[PDB]
Amino acid sequence: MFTINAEVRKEQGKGASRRLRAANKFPAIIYGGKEAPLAIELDHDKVMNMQAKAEFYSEVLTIVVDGKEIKVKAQDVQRHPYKPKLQHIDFVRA
Amino acid sequence: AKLHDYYKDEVVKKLMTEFNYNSVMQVPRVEKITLNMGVGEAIADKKLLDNAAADLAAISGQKPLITKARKSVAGFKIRQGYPIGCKVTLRGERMWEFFERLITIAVPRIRDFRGLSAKSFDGRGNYSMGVREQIIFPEIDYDKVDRVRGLDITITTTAKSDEEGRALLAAFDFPFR
Amino acid sequence: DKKSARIRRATRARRKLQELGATRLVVHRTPRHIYAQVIAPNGSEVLVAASTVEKAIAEQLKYTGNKDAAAAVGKAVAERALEKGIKDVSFDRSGFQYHGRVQALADAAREAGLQF
Amino acid sequence: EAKRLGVKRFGGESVLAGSIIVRQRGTKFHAGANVGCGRDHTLFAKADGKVKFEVKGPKNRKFISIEAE
RNA sequence: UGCCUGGCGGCCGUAGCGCGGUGGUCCCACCUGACCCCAUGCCGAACUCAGAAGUGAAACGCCGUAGCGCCGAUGGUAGUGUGGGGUCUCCCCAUGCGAGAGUAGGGAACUGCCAGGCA
RNA sequence: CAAACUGCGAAUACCGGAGAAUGUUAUCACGGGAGACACACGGCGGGUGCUAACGUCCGUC
RNA sequence: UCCUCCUAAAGAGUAACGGAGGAGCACGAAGGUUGGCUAAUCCUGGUCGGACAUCAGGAGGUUAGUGCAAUGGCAUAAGCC
């Protein structure tokens, strides 16, 4: 019932993370199961608006990447120490 | 041997009957008996320690070994390596005859006989208490008495629980608490 | 525990012999049965071994565990070692006390034609 | 005076007999094969070959081993 | 050799700790006297001289329990070598290397030789 | 939270074995002839100082 | 005069009239060989016992001890018989 937009990730490293933060984006990863973990790049404002909901803590996330629907759950979320910005999120294929 | 035969004849059978044990040796088996003298007055005089050790050797079948100091404390003014007391490690026929001679006469005739405690245990069924007025024992006669002295009595058993100690007391018929 | 204490006691000689890098003979002693083997310097290979439980060497013995049985086992181990060509192995009595069956079997091995 | 400390010879280095590998104040390394320990807790080579570093034991202690070339 | 038991090595918290179950076919342990082999700071305390009288219990081998505890990714974060900039107590730009912790996952380990027994 | 704290644990530095490549052998040793034996400023990682510094001293460029 | 910890920036060395300390010892055993044992700390019972003489049992696994002040290490013990 929740719409999520995702983009493919083709870069890796602290330099890539800095580039995404400068371009107002931040990466995220999905891991779990026999499938190899993969990284997904997401924007900042739209993802913050998505996370603003109070039901995120107990809702299954439907990631739409490469025209495919994947149900995941965010067990751990990494947040900036004091600034209200997100730099990395973690998801599991539940 | 003389008491061991009767022990195996009746105590083992009654314990097995009451505890519905399956193993033949599940009945508790006595390991050893220790007779120590932790008076603590050996610092003032050393002859009393030798006299008490000689008395213990006479009453028992062996001469006790002397025990040195364990840990020094400034409050009690105790050094390291200074002998304080001795203990007798009763095993075999000596322990059997000594325990028989005790339980025959010595235990019933004690002043203020309130009865032994069945709850005071170390934690695995070992009964380690202390008895004063050493004159109660028959071997210590008024000829060799020096002063009213106490002793520590410990019985070592293969048991690992207080229920087995209670069963052993019941076998010993446990006059009263 | 007795076995752990025995192993720790034997560990001193076991580690000391490692620097030498020479094959050693060890004997495991128990009133029920006695075991013996000759350990290679690598510590994972035995050139020859025997056990008192085996009737191939216990057929002439009244029982597996006795002084005569230990002496016979030591003599057989020494003879097999000599015929195999052990080339002057060392001695290590598994951290035991050298007063009884171990002493008898060591004496038998020495008198069989050994020089240890 | 500043007492000299450190590992004189590391792993994979050819050494000769009587050559010290590491001179340590205590015992941070243990002698292995063809390695001897002196009275000053110093490990010296007992043969000719390369040196190797390995960790073993219940306490994960370090050992020094020498392999002949 | 399919399984069980004990010894000879590595691996040294994937082998460790707590709980339950099972074991005498073989092996191992429990036993009295020791004046005899051996010896006690007393004691047969340890070891040792007879082996099953019986047992598998104190201990010990094995299986389950992922409970305690342990190892542990990809990625991210902190940091740093190189040249520059800024509002030069510090931060950023391009690049290389990259933490800890945590998550996923792993696992009640495995492996070579010898000896006996159950076939 | 830590300079006489690490159940963990970087970048960087250093040693040794093999290696295509380059720097006029650029490397080392021997004998002779030397010079100085009072360095300053800036960059990088710290100490002292009051986590007052643009004060002071270290290793390197 | 010698030695120990930072400074001394994960090789080694590395300085200021920098920040902090110990010593001029000692053995005919406190050395060696072989065979054996293995701490401080708490609880249970204990005329003497005040919690803090020692004892039997349980936990602990080197914070004890390892002669000097300190550092590195020592359980296989370098600790004890």
Numbering used by the authors:
A (entry chain V): 1 to 94
B (entry chain F): 1 to 177
C (entry chain O): 2 to 117
D (entry chain W): 13 to 81
Passage from the reporting paper:
The proline-rich antimicrobial designer peptide Api137 inhibits protein expression in bacteria by binding simultaneously to the ribosomal polypeptide exit tunnel and the release factor (RF), depleting the cellular RF pool and leading to ribosomal arrest at stop codons. Separation of cellular extracts derived from cells exposed to Api137 in a sucrose gradient reveals elevated levels of partially assembled and not fully matured precursors of the 50S subunit (pre-50S). High-resolution structures obtained by cryogenic electron microscopy demonstrate that a large proportion of pre-50S states are missing up to five proteins (uL22, bL32, uL29, bL23, and uL16) and have misfolded helices in 23S rRNA domain IV. These data suggest a second mechanism for Api137, wherein it disrupts 50S subunit assembly by inducing the formation of misfolded precursor particles potentially incapable of evolving into active ribosomes, suggesting a bactericidal mechanism.
